Amino acid sequence: ASQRRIRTTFTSAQLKELERVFAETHYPDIYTREELALKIDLTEARVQVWFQNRRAKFRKQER
Question: Which of 12, 25, 61, 62 has the largest count of CB atoms under 10 Å?
């Protein structure tokens, strides 16, 4: 099952990696999301949510 979309379930190491990938690729593709899912050991849906919310936050903070 997926995790709550508004809850953080990641470590500082996991968030660091997720942030790094975001900076490089803002919209992970099929295979990238798959690998990301393996990195966090959670459904791909969880990756999609994180990057979707992170992208929204980016746009809000974008100047």
Answer: 25
- Elucidation method: NMR
In contact, 22 and 33? CB cutoff 8 Å: no
CA–CA separation, 40 and 62 (whole Å): 27
DSSP conformation letters of 24-58: H-SS--HHHHHHHHHHHTS-HHHHHHHHHHHHHHH
What does the longest C-alpha to C-alpha distance in the chain come to?
A: 36
**Which class for 54: exposed (0-12), middle (13-18), buried (19 or more C-beta within 10 A)?**
middle
Residue 21, CB-side half-sphere exposure with 13 Å CA sphere: 23
User: Is-contact 46 2, C-beta < 8 A?
Assistant: yes
